[PDB]
Amino acid sequence: WXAXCPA
Amino acid sequence: WXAXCPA
Amino acid sequence: WXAXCPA
Amino acid sequence: TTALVCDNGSGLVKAGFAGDDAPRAVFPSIVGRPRHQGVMVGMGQKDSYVGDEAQSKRGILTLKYPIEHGIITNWDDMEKIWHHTFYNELRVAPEEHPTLLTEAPLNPKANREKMTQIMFETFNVPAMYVAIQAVLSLYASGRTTGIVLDSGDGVTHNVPIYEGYALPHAIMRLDLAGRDLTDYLMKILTERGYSFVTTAEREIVRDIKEKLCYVALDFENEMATAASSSSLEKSYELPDGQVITIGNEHFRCPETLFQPSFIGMESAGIHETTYNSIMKCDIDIRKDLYANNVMSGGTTMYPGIADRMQKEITALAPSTMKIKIIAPPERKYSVWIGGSILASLSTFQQMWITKQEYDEAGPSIVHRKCF
Amino acid sequence: TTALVCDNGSGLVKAGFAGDDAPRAVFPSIVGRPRHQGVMVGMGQKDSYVGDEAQSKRGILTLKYPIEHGIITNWDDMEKIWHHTFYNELRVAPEEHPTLLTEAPLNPKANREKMTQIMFETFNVPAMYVAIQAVLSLYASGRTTGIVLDSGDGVTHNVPIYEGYALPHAIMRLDLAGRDLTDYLMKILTERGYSFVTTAEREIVRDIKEKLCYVALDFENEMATAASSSSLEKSYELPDGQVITIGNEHFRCPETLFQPSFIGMESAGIHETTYNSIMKCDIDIRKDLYANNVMSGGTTMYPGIADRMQKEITALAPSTMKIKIIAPPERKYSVWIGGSILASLSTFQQMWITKQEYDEAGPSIVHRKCF
Amino acid sequence: TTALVCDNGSGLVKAGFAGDDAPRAVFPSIVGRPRHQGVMVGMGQKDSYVGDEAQSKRGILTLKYPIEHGIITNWDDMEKIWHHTFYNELRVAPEEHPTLLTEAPLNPKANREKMTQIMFETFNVPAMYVAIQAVLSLYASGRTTGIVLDSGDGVTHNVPIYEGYALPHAIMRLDLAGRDLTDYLMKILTERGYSFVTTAEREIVRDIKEKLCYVALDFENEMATAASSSSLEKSYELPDGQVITIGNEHFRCPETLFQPSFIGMESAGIHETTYNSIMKCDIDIRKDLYANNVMSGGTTMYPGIADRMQKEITALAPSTMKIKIIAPPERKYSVWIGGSILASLSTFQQMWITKQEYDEAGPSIVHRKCF
């Protein structure tokens, strides 16, 4: 992901 | 170690 | 060699 | 000519033409690059091995999964994997066959839009489609009502559907999946004495989890039995030849699904998320949702997972309600089978995203059809 | 009487009573055995020298470290080292003083259990304890929140703690340490003319690395400056009297910490592992983790390591967040200082593993208290 | 015209054009100078004999090997040997033919750069290359994966290669070789009595070692049998005409390879170093490395060395792993054959170090191509 978690 | 790496 | 061993 | 379904999973890419009963080619979603010196000249060393070739010689490669947790991260790596699939596995020119792809629910719109753009511009597919994986799993199951637990490799989502009317508000998405279980197994195999750190060693641990791991009916009793010096001790042979012995690690790794607090995750287990998703639906619906539980994903392939989840749900659900869990033997390829069924439907042949439709709305028409 | 803390490191055993501000005795964790003929008779020639005496006459000995990467390998050698410590360095009878030890995180249950068994049976310590080294380093630093980088001689772990609640899922352990840096320095000191192969020569190379080696702020620019025939050239005097000259080797050896690919290790550098461990905690925690970075271990004693890692993390971390690295002058004995502080706490006096609690559950009760 | 390969060994210089299946000229790497007076005038006693002529009249010479332990010590003598080769053995002007050399791993940047400079300035070779001997041995073996044990006369290295990607961190180099074995045989021939102290007598001892010495399958049993007054007693004839009898000395001289403690060396035997090098690679590589062991050099020409090494490795390696040792009959010229194969490759024709590339970077561009 972009915010929260990686991906 | 026992498996992986020596120790 | 230069240090350690001859050569 | 004929549509082809390319289910891009988070670790196993499955591709094959529509109408078949099984994927034609299944290879790991791995792109590996050389790590050591290229001393030998003239033998034919490529700069990047993709797919089964990458795993064949993983001892000199740094494998990197383009998809993590159901989201593509390295778009060049995904272009490489898609080209390798289309031109080496199916051995077809993608300029003729419409392509159907699968995406997990509750995913960034940028991901799916960029996927459509790269598949529609770099290649020349005359049409394309993106469908939710659990909907395809429900299609493969042959029914029309039920709650699907598609515990993939990177994601574990849960889409409840009644009479074909999916409820896009009880959809629960969890980030626990096969990759996290493999990482936890790597972390807890250390306790016995084996620490697998490199990516190839991670693949070895994944193989160990695939071969030996299983879910106990009751965790506390199984742990006590294992600690009481019982026969619950299997042996695995590493590629180097030396044999490792696994104690209670082989039923502690898949217990993370029912207890995400093992890896410090706030969310509840898969059984509790399924019960909550069933609860969030209408009251008159769950009479069928309880009795039409559907499983998919090769992670949902642990021995005894079905009985454990049935017991947990029956404990959570009212006592006077029949809880039936459907676990077909083809759970690993259920999403692909459903995709092949859907792509061959006569009614679905109009819901494609044609090139004329794409060229007028840009890489944003993919929101015309969202499940 | 009073508890004594015996931090068993991977090359430097530190022991001393609790309440003191510095270890009483620090000697190498080396057990040396004679290698040549015992020609002279009547000299009191012992069959195994342990500790400082082993290093004093290392020219006729085959030094062997019982610990490799924070792991006990030769249990007879560790029994010898512990007996030598308790009966020659502290000069106490261990049957009275409870003993506190330190163990690296993600270490085998077998190793720690065997250590507890050998101390409770061979010696008669009325109580014992095993604590994570990073926790003791945080205790010594005087704060309660932060991320500890304890880069010892054998292991380099990283335990993030917020408000005293350590997160046992962002703990990253690396096998790069002072021993591997010494081996790499031996390998690259070849390139100038220095073939250190024997164990005594390994100790000489370790001394060279301790004295001259340092971490450059920028690696490529430092390589350019060194190769441009600049003044970056120090001289060292070997024990036999011959002076050696070191060029760029003295800042390439400790760069392996930030680039483990130098010795063919897939894992990323210490800065990248620290950033990953910080990002593996909760989002609201890193406000203090970035600003409370803590260093320990005398390897972290390379000149300029703090500035280099601060620059690397600031490059990795968001630009609008303060990155502070704490490098106390007592980094070498930080773990022992924290252990002495903890063993003297009034609250900790109940968390001991008494002999009564040991003689009931066997050498497995130690998992009552794991950090 | 055509490239020529001049493998500069530590006692046997092998030179010849590329594409041939065998070296054209093989002569000892010996530079001899007169030692006695010159009472005879007109006999043409030169001031320095080099090559086969030096060994022909070694009775009045003091032979001095320019290369010791694969390291050039006397550069004037090395220039003399190179000139003698190029102008008497191959009988070709070196200003036209590109030259390929062999150098041991973990060998000088200093001496290798000096050798490049001396061949680019004293001679006018339009191109030059320096390659690791073990890589050339692997080329000659015809395979692309394996672990090479090139036990030369001055050095004994071990370079493991998988799929053409050598791992430059498991490369183990040992200083035990044919010269040290000859010195040990010289020292232990004193037991039965025959002791050789001059350089010509050292050559005689080398001939004895070449002819009679062999490696026993089990050292203890063979020693007991020899000490039990058995038939293990060979006879050799000295040049003058007197016959010496060798008892257990002939199978004790090459036992130093598997037991370097005989001459007070801390390092382990060649079998143990090979096993350690195999273990230092990745876990998934060892399956092929165990079954693709490659031997080269001539101290590996001892009868029964392959069986002894296979037995020792199989004892060390896991029981369920196939251990195969490749010992081609052309082990003596394996490095030269590999060099001839490599210099004739079409892909290698661009990896040369041209004179234009040399005149811009000075005697330092050789690090453009390091194996």
Ligand SMILES: Nc1ncnc2c1ncn2[C@@H]1O[C@H](COP(=O)(O)OP(=O)(O)O)[C@@H](O)[C@H]1O
């Ligand atoms: N026999 C097995 N036992 C346990 N897990 C398995 C087995 N076979 C495959 N898996 C798991 O299946 C996952 C890959 O298939 P799947 O669950 O369909 O996900 P994806 O399609 O995203 O790769 C991985 O997590 C893998 O470890």
Ligand SMILES: Nc1ncnc2c1ncn2[C@@H]1O[C@H](COP(=O)(O)OP(=O)(O)O)[C@@H](O)[C@H]1O
């Ligand atoms: N001044 C120094 N410069 C570089 N390294 C040092 C220095 N002082 C100590 N060390 C390193 O510290 C290590 C030993 O102390 P420490 O880091 O606490 O580890 P351990 O307790 O496991 O022996 C060795 O790797 C040693 O080389």
Ligand SMILES: Nc1ncnc2c1ncn2[C@@H]1O[C@H](COP(=O)(O)OP(=O)(O)O)[C@@H](O)[C@H]1O
């Ligand atoms: N048949 C043999 N028996 C014993 N030693 C041999 C034999 N053939 C060669 N050697 C030894 O091998 C060495 C020369 O060959 P090699 O090991 O390839 O070294 P180099 O590369 O210096 O020529 C010398 O030590 C020589 O005595």
Ligand SMILES: [Mg+2]
């Ligand atoms: Mg899936």
Ligand SMILES: [Mg+2]
């Ligand atoms: Mg420490």
Ligand SMILES: [Mg+2]
């Ligand atoms: Mg050779």
